[PDB]
Amino acid sequence: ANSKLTSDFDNPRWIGRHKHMFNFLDVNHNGKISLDEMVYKASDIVINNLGATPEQAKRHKDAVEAFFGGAGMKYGVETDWPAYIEGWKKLATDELEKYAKNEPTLIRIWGDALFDIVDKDQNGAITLDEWKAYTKAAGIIQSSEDCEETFRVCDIDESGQLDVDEMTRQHLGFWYTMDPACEKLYGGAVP
Ligand SMILES: O=C1N2C=C(c3ccc(O)cc3)N[C@@H](Cc3ccccc3)C2=N[C@@]1(Cc1ccc2ccccc2c1)OO
Numbered sequence: 210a211n212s213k214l215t216s217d218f219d220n221p222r223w224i225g226r227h228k229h230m231f232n233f234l235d236v237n238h239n240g241k242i243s244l245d246e247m248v249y250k251a252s253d254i255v256i257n258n259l260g261a262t263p264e265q266a267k268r269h270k271d272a273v274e275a276f277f278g279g280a281g282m283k284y285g286v287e288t289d290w291p292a293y294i295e296g297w298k299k300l301a302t303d304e305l306e307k308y309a310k311n312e313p314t315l316i317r318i319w320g321d322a323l324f325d326i327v328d329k330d331q332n333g334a335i336t337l338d339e340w341k342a343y344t345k346a347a348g349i350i351q352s353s354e355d356c357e358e359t360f361r362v363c364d365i366d367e368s369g370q371l372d373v374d375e376m377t378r379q380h381l382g383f384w385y386t387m388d389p390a391c392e393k394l395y396g397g398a399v400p
Pocket residue numbers: 226227228230231247248250251273297316317319320321323347349373374376377380384
């Protein structure tokens with residue numbers, strides 16, 4: 210019964226969750242962001258902060274390129290807020306369709322590529338310390354307390370780890386469907 214698989218695009222809390230992220234991504238307050246910037250940020254984090262090998266970094270870049278690409282972003286194009294949020298409606302729709310058909314989603318492909326870098330053991334799950342390292346390098350969470358709230362919201366495994374399958378589920382609820390069970394996934398960092 211639990212999980213919510215229907216989009217909720219007219220919910221002001223959905224629009225506002227993505228506007229928060231648009232603003233967080235628009236670090237110089239240009240009112241527009243490009244695919245060039247998104248793939249730069251992605252590879253800067255993994256290579257310069259998280260120890261990615263060259264092959265790992267390239268995999269991660271392809272996943273991020275495809276993800277924001279699915280939201281309509283392109284190299285050499287500056288995407289403003291109205292174009293961004295309409296593109297996000299298309300991304301969320303396509304992702305929910307793939308998920309319902311048991312086909313790999315762009316968010317899962319990104320998770321797999323990131324977790325290969327972030328999980329010291331390369332077995333598809335991360336410790337709280339590893340989650341702190343990733344999110345604080347990206348900047349999506351600033352405080353340890355918000356990082357800890359992720360581990361409250363998510364189902365944590367028998368070793369105290371957040372597995373990529375569970376986090377993919379949580380991301381569908383949080384980014385795509387406004388599932389009430391996924392609120393506070395990023396603590397107070399992302400409304
Ligand atoms: O899910 C993750 N996101 C989501 C976003 C996001 C941004 C805007 C928006 O409107 C919606 C979502 N941004 C980053 C941060 C980022 C942006 C651009 C380049 C590099 C980083 C991010 N990071 C993730 C990465 C992630 C982390 C764990 C995962 C686990 C399973 C599946 C997918 C996963 C994905 O965690 O917060």
